Scaffold this active site. Structure first.
Site, PDB file in Angstrom:
ATOM      1  N   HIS A  84      -8.629  -4.225   1.427  1.00  0.00           N
ATOM      2  CA  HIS A  84      -7.304  -3.655   1.129  1.00  0.00           C
ATOM      3  C   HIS A  84      -6.115  -4.285   1.866  1.00  0.00           C
ATOM      4  O   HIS A  84      -5.039  -4.436   1.293  1.00  0.00           O
ATOM      5  CB  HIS A  84      -7.279  -2.130   1.319  1.00  0.00           C
ATOM      6  N   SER A 133       0.845  -1.202   0.000  1.00  0.00           N
ATOM      7  CA  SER A 133       0.000   0.000   0.000  1.00  0.00           C
ATOM      8  C   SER A 133       0.886   1.260   0.000  1.00  0.00           C
ATOM      9  O   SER A 133       1.681   1.487  -0.928  1.00  0.00           O
ATOM     10  CB  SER A 133      -0.959  -0.047   1.209  1.00  0.00           C
ATOM     11  N   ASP A 169      -8.998  -6.690  -3.303  1.00  0.00           N
ATOM     12  CA  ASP A 169      -8.544  -5.350  -2.948  1.00  0.00           C
ATOM     13  C   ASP A 169      -9.080  -4.373  -3.979  1.00  0.00           C
ATOM     14  O   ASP A 169      -8.676  -4.407  -5.140  1.00  0.00           O
ATOM     15  CB  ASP A 169      -7.012  -5.314  -2.946  1.00  0.00           C
TER      16      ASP A 169
END
Lengths: 362, 362
Positions: B340, B149, B307
């Protein structure tokens, strides 16, 4: 071109039994009409509004108005929803805050707005209420039901809830069910209202959660930029200086996003309407095919290239299930430069696909 | 399996000149290390954290700790970042709030936290600061830089900012630039803080904007559900009753999302870090290819099927540009059930692809 000065009208009915068991008694539906209904009652088009929208889809309320109706470039003499040929209808959804039965409706005991006492409504309820209105205007079968975004979800519901009560269905920038992403934006908005000090369990009256709702609605303004236009705004580098120096610190007011306190919305209503949107699901794949097999009308599905809120893939899933169900369906992806509300803007290629769809029954 | 009790360490350097012209003097970098550095200084791996994360990527601070480090299933004896073979490093980003130079740093004049006086930082700055730390530990060339991320964006920056200072680069659930959607979620969070009554131009100290930051962070909890798990939660119907009856009205507390006031974050820091993320762009297509042509290291890019925050398409754009630039790159899309943060969870197939990548230099 302009339809001119329009009055909001109010249709009232004894009751509406909602899908969750609750009852609206009476039911009020604020609506506006544009054009003239044929003696054959067969040239009528129902416009369904989106989250920000209302019954005022075209024209003006007074000479001093600074903007026309929300789809005014598409509704009027010569325009795509031609009021020279058609009888155009638009109504505020129940749960809304611009005239239909909703949380601002006065309670028969306390003589204050219902607020949080108003029952949860669904998109199926909103469409049941529109059916009542349409029947009352003398119409058994609509020529068309059209709308974008939230409005396209109502239009989809119509095509299967009352499949023989419409000939055509225009679903623009829409979906058979909200993604996690769409629900997340609404959930953040709802939580902003819930955590506002003025929320008062939804029984506010003197002092509303203006800040919470400003935040909830700002979401719709921030999400308006496409991927390219947002990147253009943000560039490849953060600002010079600090939060204080860039005057980034004095950014409280930016929550209203240029919009004033007079163009008025309601926090409860936002919760009611977005909950209806988030909880509506016709599904996808086989389940969506099965759900849409009831429909008999012709379908026009229009998506927008830069729309990432209701992206072309959501429209494609509808068109795929409408082909798997053996239904009349056309699909156009229009090129666009906006983050979601491109269906609202005058566009030669949108005008053309709309006029041709309504003009040619094949 | 567990690395055990770890101390947070603090590396301090005279200054860091930031990309926007401002200067950090001194620069502090809070970091933790796991394993033992070789006398050849060549077995070192830098872990870069994500938005919620910090330097505490593994192990415990005390016996009474209730949870280990944020990537503890991946860092330790026998684990994917094997502390039996490797020297694992993780540091808090500058602009952060868990030990590195940031808005909570004490101001040399007012002896209060910098707050909004702290300069804007970029991802390039964050990586410059990590370079300082790594050099100070005696390391000229890292074996690997890894992160997911936000952490994968730092890892990408490393591969081109100091292309000859790393042999390998692991970019998990990440992107070369934020979409409008990602920026919109951060912008809403930032506005929630800005409009909080306790914000005080960012010079709060006695009373922080707890509500605004709770809202800003709730976004990360709400976005955690996949499309399927969010639809499962929402179903096909809204609730029975009304906002008051379902106790939907008493939902203020749900802004904290089960999390307590003790696990502490800072509003300024949230603004600083998310601004760095939003303003970072290596671009896409030809521009991204050109930007990534500096890299010399080997690349592992891992995306996650469910995600939707950092979706497989963002990873694919990286892999496409890394192939157009003639670079060593592997791409795995792992099956996942989360919105996520799947890169954080123990997963046999993730463990396997990581251990094999680090073990086999081809």
């Amino acid at each position: 071109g302009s339809i001119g000065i329009i009055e909001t009208k109010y249709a009232e009915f004894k009751e509406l039994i909602l899908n969750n068991g609750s009852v609206l008694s009476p039911v009020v539906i604020a609506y506006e009409t544009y054009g003239t209904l044929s003696s054959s009652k067969n040239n009528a088009i129902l416009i369904c509004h989106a989250l920000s929208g209302d019954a005022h889809a075209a024209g003006y309320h007074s000479g001093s108005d600074k903007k026309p109706g929300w789809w005014d470039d598409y509704i009027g003499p010569g325009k795509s929803f031609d009021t020279n040929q058609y009888f155009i209808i638009c109504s505020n959804v129940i749960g809304g805050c611009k005239g239909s039965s909703g949380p601002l409706s006065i309670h028969p005991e306390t003589s204050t707005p219902y607020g949080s006492r108003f029952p949860f409504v669904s998109i199926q309820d909103m469409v049941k209420a529109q059916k009542l209105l349409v029947e009352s205007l003398g119409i058994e079968k609509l020529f068309c039901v059209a709308g974008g975004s939230m409005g396209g979800m109502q239009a989809l519901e119509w095509s299967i809830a009352y499949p023989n009560s419409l000939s055509n269905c225009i679903v623009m920038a829409s979906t058979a069910e909200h993604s996690a992403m769409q629900i997340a934006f609404n959930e953040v908005g709802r939580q902003a209202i819930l955590s506002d000090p003025n929320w008062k369990n939804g029984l506010y009256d003197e002092n509303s959660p203006r800040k919470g709702l400003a935040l909830a609605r700002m979401v719709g303004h921030i999400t308006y930029l496409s991927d390219d236009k947002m990147r253009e705004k943000f560039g490849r580098n953060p600002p010079r200086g600090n939060i204080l120096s860039t005057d980034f610190a004095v950014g409280s007011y930016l929550i209203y996003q240029g919009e004033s306190f007079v163009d008025r919305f309601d926090a409860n209503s936002y919760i009611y309407v977005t909950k209806a949107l988030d909880h509506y699901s016709l599904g996808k794949g086989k389940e969506l095919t099965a759900a849409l097999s009831n429909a008999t009308c012709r379908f026009l599905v229009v998506s927008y290239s830069s729309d990432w809120l209701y992206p072309p893939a959501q429209s494609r899933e509808i068109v795929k299930s409408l082909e798997a169900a053996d239904k009349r369906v056309f699909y156009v992806e229009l090129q666009s430069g906006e983050g979601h509300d491109s269906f609202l803007l005058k566009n030669p290629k949108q005008i053309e696909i709309l006029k041709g769809f309504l003009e040619n029954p094949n």
